Amino acid sequence: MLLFCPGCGNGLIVEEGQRCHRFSCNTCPYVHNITRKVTNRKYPKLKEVDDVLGGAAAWENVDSTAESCPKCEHPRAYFMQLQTRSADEPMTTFYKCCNAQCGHRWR
Amino acid sequence: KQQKVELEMAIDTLNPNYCRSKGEQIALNVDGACADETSTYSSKLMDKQTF
Amino acid sequence: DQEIVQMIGTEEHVMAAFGPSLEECQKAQIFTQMQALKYIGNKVRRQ
Amino acid sequence: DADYARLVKGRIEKTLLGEISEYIEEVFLPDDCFILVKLSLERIRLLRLEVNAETVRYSICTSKLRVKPGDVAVHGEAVVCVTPRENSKSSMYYVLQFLKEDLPKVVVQGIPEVSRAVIHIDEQSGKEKYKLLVEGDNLRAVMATHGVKGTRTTSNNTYEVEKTLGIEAARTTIINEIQYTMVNHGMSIDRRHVMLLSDLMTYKGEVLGITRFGLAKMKESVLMLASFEKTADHLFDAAYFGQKDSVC
Amino acid sequence: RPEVIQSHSIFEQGPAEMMKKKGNWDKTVDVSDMGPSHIINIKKEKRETDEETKQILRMLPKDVSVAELLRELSLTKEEELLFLQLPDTLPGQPPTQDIAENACTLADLTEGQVGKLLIRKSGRVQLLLGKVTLDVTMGTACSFLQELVSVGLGDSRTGEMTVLGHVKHKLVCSPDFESLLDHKHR
Amino acid sequence: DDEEETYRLWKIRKTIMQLCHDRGYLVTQDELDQTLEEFKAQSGDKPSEGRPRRTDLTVLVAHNDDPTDQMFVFFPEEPKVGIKTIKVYCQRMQEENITRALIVVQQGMTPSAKQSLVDMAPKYILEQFLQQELLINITEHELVPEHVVMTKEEVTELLARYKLRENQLPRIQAGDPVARYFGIKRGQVVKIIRPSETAGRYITYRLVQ
DNA sequence: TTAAGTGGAGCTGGATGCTCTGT
DNA sequence: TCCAGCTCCACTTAA
RNA sequence: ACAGAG
Ligand SMILES: [Zn+2]
Ligand SMILES: [Zn+2]
């Protein structure tokens, strides 16, 4: 912890004297004998998370279900739509289909 | 006019908060060894603090 | 240095973040304005 | 089950000392000054980690201020005191402040290059298996820990795969990764093209880029080098070495 | 250093850690009741927040002007030196000061009653300084040392310096622009 | 620990058994299938077990070539192996009249000793393997196709079918880990059997250079 | 005690899409 | 505006 | 050197 000299207000340093450890100024004679226990606790942040993920419900909390893919036609699906390329005047979609765990991903 | 104040306060030496080993060295550094004609500190120690 | 830490901030983590710059300045013997001007003057690109 | 997955997760993910210590205090006494670290053993119980006081004593004395093993004690099973000495090189003995902010960033368990690891579970209804997606850059370490099936683990960085598993595995990695990136954006290339690209990158025993640096090691023609990039320097080098050039 | 360190399933006792931690630093060499070892209680080192100076020991809300004047009047009879700021011009004419409509300050007025101070219901404090009422607000609260001194130059080369007391609080006065503007809107 | 440390001394020993079985050295069948609980029998945990000189392999002779063609496997104990320990192993190898030796360092090797392993002798060839590379057999990995070191009478038929030279083949380096697994020097040709998407297989060739 | 081989850090030099159509 | 080579400097081993 | 066009 920062502690400052009552005289000149520079920063104190800890050093050792002939009877005690002392807080001492570097620029004036002031010293302060450590007579008793003095402490400073940091209390850092612990690693709070454990973070298991990738569950199927964490995958299918998106709108689409019971639609039709051009590959395997299954109802349990995971869709996506893009538009952010205006060279593509048509729309952009991508689909995931996992009822039979077939796993297609096409345009 | 052009109001500027300078003070000088006398700090003691008999208290435990005065490391005399460092005070003798800083008084030898600022003053001459035995000149004392004009001098920042009077004795052989840092006696004053100027404001 | 107390007035410098007063102007920067008097929170705990602010002082803890700023401390290694006071500890760096105390390594050199800069304690007076004439010393600081002498240190900065010898870094100036002379025009 | 995930009880086994978190063990090997904690064996590879980088864990800091400050992440498991519930307080790190400096204690000034009339006879000595030191720094005390109290470990939070409840979190060690819940994170399922192989760390205690004696292991933290051995993780310290690794590239920190050159502390001595006599300076560190293990008084309990949770407390560890680190008594500092003189750094004696551009530092004051008040270097207690250096270990006040540097000792919480030492590593006590796992691999130093792994930023984070995560448990990822599958989608199938006939099974449920738990893989381990690791965000790091040390393939050799993650292959070699106890409990990770090292024969079936891969990477995305071709340089690590070349350095660890050879040039042929790097060729396979280039093929798989280019084909994966082309599939994810809806494109479709026949695999013979990416096969030819990977064989061109890896026919001199080393994965070579398609920069001007990889092209300077493959092609031999001087005008082919000077027609692409750094047009001046190849000309003076061919003048210096007296290098003749076919028009092949 | 032997690397293959061994560990066990047993659960650490709470008090066993507490008493080990206790025994690690509760030892004290305070037995030296001697002069050097002694320490001056009025020259402790300054912990940085000046309201929070005491780091070693023998063992906040923000007040307002009505709470400021109540504690100095009802709670205590003892007088207190304040430090109040004024607006830039006080609402008067410089009395035969050889002018231009320039600034009118306290250096141009005379002794005698200059106004009255009205503490209203619900914390409103005004300074009726003639026909206009100013507004009094607590300023930034200082926590460092301030001394009110009298420097008298009784002779050309020498004189007297005398300390009158410590100044704690700082007040701020400001014109009520809404009431000044609501007389004649524009 | 001591459930995971003796695991390493088991797994590294098993991988060195397979590495010696693939180089044409005589390995018995039980050593290739030495069970962990059976490895507990001849050596227990670290207070009863001894690391550095109890797990050596000098039984290994080239059963294809010759019974005097022999090779050491040493497990040094200190993490950074200096020149002195290399000189100890070299004088032991000088005593037994063996030409080839392996060294399994635990953390690394000092840079003046990596310089030593090249220039001590061309007749005394020594290979540094880290103990972290031997915790898995890289030939068993699914990204690594099966390599086969070729005889001179097969290299000659390779270079006669395509009408080539040696320096027109593709290259493999000698610092390649799969090259150091088989222990191959400059001038040998490996056969790489690549698996396909179909049941077919595409054969290819690399020169050590 | 010091000769030396090798890490890490700062400096330097290279590169950054294809055409026509006019002022 | 981003990124490989080149050179300078502390940091251990070894005698 | 600037503006256009695909
Ligand atoms: Zn001071
Ligand atoms: Zn589909």
Tab-separated table of N, CA and C in Angstrom, chain F residues 10-11 36 39 54 58 79 98 159 161 165 170 199:
chain	number	residue	atom	x	y	z
F	10	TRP	N	5.458	-46.191	-18.034
F	10	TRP	CA	4.886	-47.313	-18.762
F	10	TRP	C	4.656	-46.997	-20.236
F	11	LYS	N	4.042	-45.845	-20.519
F	11	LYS	CA	3.660	-45.497	-21.884
F	11	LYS	C	4.880	-45.229	-22.754
F	36	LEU	N	-0.191	-52.375	-17.879
F	36	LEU	CA	0.143	-51.434	-16.812
F	36	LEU	C	0.176	-52.112	-15.453
F	39	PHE	N	3.127	-54.030	-15.424
F	39	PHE	CA	4.313	-53.201	-15.237
F	39	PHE	C	4.472	-52.808	-13.776
F	54	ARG	N	17.018	-48.335	-14.341
F	54	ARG	CA	16.319	-49.599	-14.173
F	54	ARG	C	15.466	-49.934	-15.384
F	58	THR	N	18.792	-52.647	-23.696
F	58	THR	CA	19.999	-52.970	-24.442
F	58	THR	C	19.881	-54.384	-24.976
F	79	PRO	N	16.680	-33.102	-15.866
F	79	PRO	CA	15.861	-32.608	-16.985
F	79	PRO	C	16.665	-32.048	-18.144
F	98	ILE	N	28.792	-51.125	-28.844
F	98	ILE	CA	27.531	-50.877	-29.531
F	98	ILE	C	27.653	-49.571	-30.308
F	159	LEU	N	13.153	-46.053	-59.788
F	159	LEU	CA	13.786	-45.105	-60.691
F	159	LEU	C	13.912	-45.638	-62.109
F	161	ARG	N	11.221	-47.408	-63.511
F	161	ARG	CA	9.879	-47.422	-64.079
F	161	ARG	C	9.505	-46.057	-64.634
F	165	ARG	N	15.860	-39.588	-61.802
F	165	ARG	CA	17.041	-39.564	-60.965
F	165	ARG	C	16.598	-39.542	-59.509
F	170	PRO	N	10.007	-36.221	-54.737
F	170	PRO	CA	9.648	-35.321	-53.639
F	170	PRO	C	10.533	-35.565	-52.426
F	199	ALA	N	-12.158	-47.176	-51.155
F	199	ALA	CA	-11.308	-48.230	-50.614
F	199	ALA	C	-9.944	-48.273	-51.288
